[PDB]
Every structure is written in C-alpha cells, then in structure tokens.
Amino acid sequence: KPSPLLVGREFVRQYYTLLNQAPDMLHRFYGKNSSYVHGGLDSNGKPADAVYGQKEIHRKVMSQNFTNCHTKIRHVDAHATLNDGVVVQVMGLLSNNNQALRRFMQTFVLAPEGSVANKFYVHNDIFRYQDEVF
C-alpha cells in the first residue's frame, strides 16, 4: 500500500501538468459518478454549482477554456480516507491565459478503481478562487 502523502503529491503533479499540457484530456482523471466544480460565478453572483459524470466534467472543462495555465503549488496535504481513498488539500496560485496569478483552494478525493492495484481516479474535485468568495 502506497503512502497517501506521496500518492497525493504525485496526483497533484500529474493533474496540474495535464491542466496545461492537454486540458482536453482532464476528463480522463474522473470516473462514472465524479463531482467537479472549478470556482465560477454566474448572473446571480453566487458561486457556480458542481457537475457530475465524466461527460459533463469534460464539457465543463472545455467550457472553462484553459489556455496555458501556470500553477504554483504552495501547499499539498494528502491523507487517508474511506476505502483506502486519499483526500488531498491544495493551496496555490493559478493563472489562466498568462494573466495575473490568483490564489486558489482545492480539495481532491481520489478513490481506488478496484481492479488495477495502485490505481486511483478523481471522485471529487472542488476548486475555488479566493478572490471570488472573500
């Protein structure tokens, strides 16, 4: 059984590498019933709701139009959870389209796939920009 801390660190490295190297394959990280929210607003001004399902996750990611996003990961904290899952808490800065970096707080929940050993998928993805709620 791998260390949850190293599992979370490796997952964060791979996820934020793929977020800019090829954002259109970010949906491959998620499973059949996975929650995803990436810190957006709307007309009412309230934070955007999450989406569920790989397809809706892919649609939302494509709508988010990530172009060469640079992320500075300032803190990663990974710990054990239900069904040998891993909960990851990420503090960092993300800048999209080479604009100003924005502080962000993120929570990942990765569950084992079940068949392939040492394999995980993103069950939950919660991303929020600090400047949108504070």
Partner: protein, 38 residues
C-alpha cells in the same frame, strides 16, 4: 506503478517531457556553438 484515471504508467510524463526547441536543432545544440567561443 501509481497511475490515475485510465492513463497508463508514465503516459503523462512521456507526453509532457519535451524541451523547448527551435528549427531542426537538437536541444542544447544551439548554445554549443556559443560555448565554442570563449
């Protein structure tokens, strides 16, 4: 063999492991001519 999603072992690394190069030069070839000069 720690993998995430359906990505195979080292697929993301392989895809994202490519240095910035210009023209047909191999990486680190251009600065070699400069290093030839003192």
């Amino acid at each position: 063999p720690i993998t995430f999603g359906d990505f195979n072992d080292g697929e993301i690394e392989s895809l994202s492991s490519e240095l910035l190069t210009f023209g047909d030069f191999l990486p680190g070839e251009v600065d070699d001519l400069t290093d030839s000069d003192w």
